[PDB]
Amino acid sequence: GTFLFTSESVGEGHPDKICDQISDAVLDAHLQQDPDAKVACETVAKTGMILLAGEITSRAAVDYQKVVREAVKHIGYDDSSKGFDYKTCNVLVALEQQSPDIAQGVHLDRNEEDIGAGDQGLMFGYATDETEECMPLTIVLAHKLNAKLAELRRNGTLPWLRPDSKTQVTVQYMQDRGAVLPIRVHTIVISVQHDEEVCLDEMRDALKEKVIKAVVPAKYLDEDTIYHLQPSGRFVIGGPQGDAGLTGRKIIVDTYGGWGAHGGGAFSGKDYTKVDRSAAYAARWVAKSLVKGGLCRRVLVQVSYAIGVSHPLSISIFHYGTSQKSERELLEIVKKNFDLRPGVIVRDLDLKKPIYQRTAAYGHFGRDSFPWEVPKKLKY
Amino acid sequence: GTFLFTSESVGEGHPDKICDQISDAVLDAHLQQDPDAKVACETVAKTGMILLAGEITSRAAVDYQKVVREAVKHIGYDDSSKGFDYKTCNVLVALEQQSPDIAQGVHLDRNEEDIGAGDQGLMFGYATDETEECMPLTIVLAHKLNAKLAELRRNGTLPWLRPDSKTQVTVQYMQDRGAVLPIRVHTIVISVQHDEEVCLDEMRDALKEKVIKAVVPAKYLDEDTIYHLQPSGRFVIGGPQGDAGLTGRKIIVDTYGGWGAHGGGAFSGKDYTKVDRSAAYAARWVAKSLVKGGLCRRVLVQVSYAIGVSHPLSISIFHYGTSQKSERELLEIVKKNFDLRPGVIVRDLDLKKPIYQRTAAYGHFGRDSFPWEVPKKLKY
């Protein structure tokens, strides 16, 4: 009756995550000056290079060199010995205005509440009662392992650490009337970029004792747990030098770690009219409201849109058998309690606020009591 | 007892798909000369620009200018009036060798069958008996609508069409003991780039009569079906000029349209040692083998890897209640019939063959009897 499930996470210096953070730093910089900025900022990173490409129409005056370099500094890439340096890297900008054909079809001359979706697409939200924050344990643990690495790097206790890391956690679960119950951790992987001087045994010992044991409750770890710590054997070259990064290439890390579902759309670098982000945040909010409201133990919500059309084209609720109410009844409750037009979501979730860089590492969900993490009290 | 489900697809000239196709054209060009090429080629597209960034170690001599421009020509961007021209665009190359630290940990001095996974990660395969090709009807129809647009563009019957398109299909389904049964098409969206001269009513009439009715069986369409055809009202600016493209930003279009699950890893631009692609293809092969073998009607397969380790860390089977056998029994059948090491998958699925550009539009699954689409006869 048990099964395995695996999720991964990556650190702040993973090259794809660097791009997500830079894209959201650019978004935040625009929103600080122009709350109605239209932003679709993609970032690419390779050895010595950050390239910004995409479309921004905004009244803000943004110094892209400063914004990009400050984001890279925060991540920790500050010296050529680490493979990347905010002070001396190339920052290239290929940003144009938003297409006028898009603007006229989406938002020009429209009442804000009745703004059209900025694109077509589908989005999902998910929630599970297996943790208090209503997220899968596999990804929660994977994120926390990367956060612990960054903490021990920044506090100097493991000074050989560099910012690029990846983690992966496999949990054995049992099923319980459609809900899932974590039993034990089956396998953990950690790979992290390191300096030239530290040896492999020192790193493997530290990763077990100072990282894993600091993060994962002992009750989940036993004599059979498998550890793959620095499994490649050597990871000195890292960051964009080791692997090109792009915005929107960590969409499963950003969401539910393989649980639930995903509609395909990236979050970072996008203002609220891009429903890939706003409607996925709203769908999370719905899912978490249903679980915290006691209606379900686990739930998946789908929504979809057409460019230029305000109301969603479809809404669907899947409760895995974890409610006494039918999925049709839950759908009716959702329709009575939520208005999923983007021009209403923006108000409910405060999506003109420049908090997006905070979302761009360690997952967008299950953390920090963002508005989409505060359950709505449901009337039914 | 019914529910809605929505999936989308995009055309060959959608800027993200342009990038996937170019990345796979580069991969194929290397494999034609060096079957053991190590390729991790990302492409970015914006107005007037294709940038290649990533890591390739290969004995091939590849003319990137020619390979990129020939791919763009095939897609149909051949004139400045269309917003992009293979003859005159900028092609920039930022390609380096594969990191030596990766190479030593993955494949150097290893027997091919015992090559390590080229990265950690998780991957899923899915199959559903709702269509003969074992794919969800929503995405099959969405892909076919884009293919029809390209056909009518290329044969000159709708000469106002340009290559950038998106489609979205919402189907009403019923549930049947864990399997799903399509009932009707609830909503269709089509947006496609067009010339300056054609008017909106002409386009909407053609999209209904010459595209939708040519693709979607009439039995699924009724008086209540909702059509959003050119919903933005104007789409003259398109391709990379309208929206930046990047490789690996259509991973749900490339797979199951929101059904099943996704592990997050992109396919295009990657050789077989990158398990994001090879293990997802193998997982599809497993799933389709279970459904075509009569063991399940619908199934989701998860696998995961650690960099440098050959055997998967975890394998999981979820049959939605559509088998008389338990998921544990199915897992045992899978373990007895499949060897999911990358250095074995490469042999079973012929993954050194330069056929990858053919996979990079209209989905990687459900088409053309690729090796992962030919079911394995199972012994149990």
Ligand SMILES: CSC[C@H]1O[C@@H](n2cnc3c(N)ncnc32)[C@H](O)[C@@H]1O
């Ligand atoms: C294998 S390339 C994909 C990711 O794996 C990590 N990586 C890079 N080099 C190594 C290495 N030598 N060993 C382990 N992981 C690595 C980086 O996070 C990179 O973005």
Ligand SMILES: CSC[C@H]1O[C@@H](n2cnc3c(N)ncnc32)[C@H](O)[C@@H]1O
């Ligand atoms: C809205 S930007 C995302 C995608 O939508 C499409 N698109 C671009 N411009 C328009 C438009 N004016 N109307 C409808 N869809 C568009 C392109 O396929 C683009 O890559």
Ligand SMILES: [K+]
């Ligand atoms: K990459």
Ligand SMILES: [K+]
């Ligand atoms: K884009």
Ligand SMILES: [Mg+2]
């Ligand atoms: Mg990546």
Ligand SMILES: [Mg+2]
């Ligand atoms: Mg999208």
Ligand SMILES: [Mg+2]
């Ligand atoms: Mg895109």
Ligand SMILES: [Mg+2]
């Ligand atoms: Mg990956």
Ligand code: NA
């Ligand atoms: Na503005």
Ligand code: NA
């Ligand atoms: Na899942």
Ligand code: NA
């Ligand atoms: Na989304």
Ligand code: NA
């Ligand atoms: Na709230």
Ligand code: NA
């Ligand atoms: Na080679």
Ligand code: NA
């Ligand atoms: Na799904």
Ligand code: NA
């Ligand atoms: Na994958």
Ligand code: NA
């Ligand atoms: Na085969």
